[PDB]
Design a binder for this molecule. Structure first.
Ligand SMILES: CC1(C)C(=O)N(c2ccc(S(=O)(=O)C(F)(F)F)cc2)C(=O)N1Cc1ccnc2[nH]ccc12
Ligand code: NI
Ligand SMILES: [Zn+2]
Length: 275
């Protein structure tokens, strides 16, 4: 089961406003929470819900997925603030990222400086180095799962695979689970091997998204064509107008042998040696 703890928040302290989109287990909303941040009477929050229909099994899956976040203390990972495990619906509340997901934000820009692009890259790498140091492999790192604050700071999040807006980013390979095949490493595509090294592959696709303002990777290829192209050692082209430094960083992340890719710590160092 799930054992309630000091992260429990009384439900009456939480107010919902408009919806943010369909999560893995239910609708996600924007809202306000009383008594969750020190020196702060009201806090704007994201509220993740479980469908009333969902099984007690799936409720416990949702809670135990949020319990991973209790261990986190990184300002580049979206922060847990509370859990509502008592009564229906089951909620978890987090810090609200007012500008939404990075894919949406990049689409909205449709000429960033190397400076702004490398700053975002470094913010993402900060949160991914932290997660990978805490034995967390994200498996769906992509601009659509990065989140943008009021101040334009980027943080790692996860909105799951079920939002209608990003239906084209997922393939039900063999009719089974949805897979983000255009962001997946060769070894993830071939053998279902997901590692810190496959997160670094996906990071290189996020850099390509930054540099294209979130074009579709491998536009023109079907999902089956992407599988073959990437597993046979094919790569995304250098984006139009791409700075040398950003494309070089992408190429490092796309080494076919996962042991040849930089770690996120090495990415942060090489971004700090430009600054
Ligand atoms: C769906 C929801 C609320 C959520 O649950 N998460 C989430 C955050 C962190 C993790 S985590 O395990 O720490 C990580 F990052 F994967 F390592 C998991 C899920 C989100 O990002 N979300 C979107 C979201 C959050 C805040 N403000 C927003 N504004 C617009 C969407 C939005
Ligand atoms: Ni920072
Ligand atoms: Zn399940």
């Amino acid at each position: 089961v799930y054992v309630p703890d000091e992260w429990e928040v009384a439900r009456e302290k939480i107010t919902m406003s408009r919806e943010l989109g369909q999560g893995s287990f239910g609708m996600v909303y924007e809202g306000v929470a009383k008594g969750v941040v020190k020196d702060e009477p009201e806090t704007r929050v994201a509220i993740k819900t479980v469908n009333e229909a969902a099984s007690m099994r799936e409720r416990i899956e949702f809670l135990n997925e949020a319990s991973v976040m209790k261990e986190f203390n990184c300002h580049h990972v979206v922060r847990l603030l509370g859990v509502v495990s008592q009564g229906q619906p089951t909620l978890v509340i987090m810090e609200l990222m007012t500008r939404g997901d990075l894919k949406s934000y990049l689409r909205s820009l449709r000429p960033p400086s190397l400076s702004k692009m490398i700053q975002m890259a470094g913010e993402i790498a900060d949160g991914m180095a932290y997660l990978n140091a805490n034995k967390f492999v994200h498996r769906d790192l992509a601009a659509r799962n990065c989140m943008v604050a009021e101040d334009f700071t980027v943080k790692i999040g996860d909105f799951g695979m079920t939002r209608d807006i990003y239906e084209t980013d997922y393939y039900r390979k063999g009719g089974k689970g949805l897979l983000p095949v255009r962001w997946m490493s060769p070894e993830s595509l071939k053998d279902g091997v997901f590692t810190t090294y496959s997160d670094v592959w996906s990071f290189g696709v996020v850099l390509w998204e930054i540099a294209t303002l979130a074009e579709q990777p491998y536009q023109g290829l079907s999902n089956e064509q992407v599988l073959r192209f990437v597993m046979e050692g094919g790569l995304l082209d250098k984006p139009d107008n791409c700075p040398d430094m950003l494309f070089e960083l992408m190429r490092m992340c796309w080494q076919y042998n996962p042991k040849m890719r930089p770690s996120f710590l090495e990415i942060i160092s090489s971004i700090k040696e430009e600054m």
